[PDB]
Paper text:
The envelope glycoprotein (Env) on [name]-1 virions mediates cell entry and is the target of broadly neutralizing antibodies (bNAbs). Soluble native-like Env trimers have emerged as a promising platform for [name]-1 vaccine design. The N terminus of heptad repeat 1 (HR1N, residues 547 to 569) was identified as a major cause of Env metastability, leading to the design of cleaved, HR1-redesigned trimers or UFO trimers with removal of the cleavage site between gp120 and gp41 (19). First, we identified tier 2 mouse NAbs that were elicited by a 60-meric I3-01 NP presenting 20 HR1-redesigned BG505 trimers.
Numbering used by the authors:
A (entry chain L): 1 to 27, 27A, 27B, 27C, 27D, 28 to 214
B (entry chain H): 1 to 52, 52A, 52B, 52C, 53 to 82, 82A, 82B, 82C, ...
Write the structure that this text describes.
């Protein structure tokens, strides 16, 4: 298959500046001077919308700030100047030969100034514990950029494999994110330990923040 | 005006079958190559199957992931293309789109709104709702966070409101995660004045349309 390497997976650009999204094909997508590379925009809940066809041609009604370039194996979609309704997923897609293949996608978001998260920790409820499972939740509220390291420790033992993270979409008014990390243990494993800690590293914090509790302490 | 309309998605168990249908309007359908493309819960696009024209002997193509399990066909008289899916697998879960032409040189294309497929051994089940109680240790700044953990439901989605929709500012309802058990979970959180914690009542209203259930949970200091 023609494999498309799309970069970056996540792109933050300031409104008014240029967003450049790239796609490398594993082999040429050219036939007779035409480069069969398409670009799509996808908004949440909606189907893909064709922006650029055959590498460099704007679709009908597509705004002039979208443009495409490239040939052979190397292609870019350029959005300049970026506007707020350009936040979306973008995908390249080769139309040279079946099987039709797509890049992995780029999520384009709005770049804003750094904002440190507020961090909170929630012990499992008494109601859930009697059910046989314990969920411990660490919340990072209203931060930017999205990159953060959230590390669970149980009596100082670094946890791995037993937590899942979820992140909100960028806030429409302040452009920040919030994130949950949820540690899942058996009721039995939870009652084996005393100190539950969530350590958060983020560019907005001069020193990584630990929130912790002693099991059963109001 | 050209429109493509998909139908036939829904819940199914692994090993089961479903047939999707796509009806085209406003186009000379017999002249159009038709493809199905799916989108994972991860939000990526994957081409599934294509069928060509009568003049091309209705040539069909399949992604290796679906070869021998899916069958694409068309009925030019009804401007429709179909995807029969057999021996379904969890990884076939996703939104399925009908599109044309996808391949070759084209200055315009068409896509439906999509139809959803969820392949799972899980039974439909409404969520258990647990409080994320505001901490009894003080905050430096006088804002407190609290929430509801909405756990062990199937299929998606749930909706969460706070105080019957009166509380919307500061609310974050996270995307669900599929747990190793095959059931989904998420939390909804809100930030409130810590000085309201003894005065203001906070209740999360959790609706799960697939089970036709609603759960209200009051969230108090422990």
């Amino acid at each position: 298959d023609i494999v498309l390497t799309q970069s970056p997976a996540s792109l933050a650009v300031s409104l008014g500046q240029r967003a450049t999204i790239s796609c490398r094909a594993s082999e040429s997508v050219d036939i007779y001077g035409i480069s069969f590379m398409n670009w799509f925009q996808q908004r949440p809940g909606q189907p893909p919308k064709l922006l650029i066809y055959a590498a460099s041609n704007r679709g009908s009604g597509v705004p002039a700030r979208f443009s495409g370039s490239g040939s052979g194996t190397d292609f870019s979609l350029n959005i300049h100047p970026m506007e707020e309704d350009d936040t979306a997923m973008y995908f390249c897609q080769q139309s040279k030969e079946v099987p039709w293949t797509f890049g992995g996608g780029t999520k384009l978001e709005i770049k804003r100034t750094v904002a440190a998260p507020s961090v909170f920790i929630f012990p499992p409820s008494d109601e859930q514990l009697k059910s046989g499972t314990a969920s411990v939740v660490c919340l990072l509220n209203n931060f930017y950029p999205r990159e953060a390291k959230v590390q669970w420790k149980v009596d100082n033992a670094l946890q791995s494999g037993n937590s899942q993270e979820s992140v909100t979409e960028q806030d429409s008014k302040d452009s920040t994110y919030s994130l949950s990390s949820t540690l899942t243990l058996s009721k039995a494993d939870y009652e084996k330990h005393k100190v539950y800690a969530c350590e958060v590293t983020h560019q907005g914090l001069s020193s990584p923040v630990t929130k912790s509790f002693n099991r059963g302490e109001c | 005006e050209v429109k493509l309309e998909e139908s036939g998605g829904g819940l199914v168990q692994p090993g089961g079958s479903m047939k999707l249908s796509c009806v085209a309007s406003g186009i000379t359908f017999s002249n159009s190559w038709m493809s199905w493309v799916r989108q994972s819960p991860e939000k990526g696009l994957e081409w599934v199957a294509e069928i060509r024209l009568k003049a091309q002997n209705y040539a069909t193509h399949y992604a290796a992931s679906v070869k021998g399990r899916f069958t694409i066909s068309r009925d030019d008289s009804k401007s429709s293309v179909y995807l029969q899916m057999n021996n379904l697998r969890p990884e076939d879960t996703g939104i399925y789109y009908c599109t044309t032409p996808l391949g070759g040189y084209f200055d315009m294309d068409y896509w439906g709104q999509g139809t959803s497929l969820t392949v799972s051994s899980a039974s439909t089940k409404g969520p258990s709702v647990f409080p994320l109680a505001p901490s009894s240790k003080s905050t430096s700044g006088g804002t407190a966070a609290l929430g509801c953990l909405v756990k062990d439901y199937f299929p998606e989605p749930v909706t969460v409101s706070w105080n019957s929709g009166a509380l919307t500012s500061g609310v974050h309802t996270f995307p669900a995660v599929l747990q190793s058990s095959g059931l989904y979970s998420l939390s909804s959180v809100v930030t409130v004045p810590s000085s309201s914690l003894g005065t203001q009542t906070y209740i999360c209203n959790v609706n799960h349309k697939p089970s036709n259930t609603k759960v209200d949970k009051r969230v108090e200091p422990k």
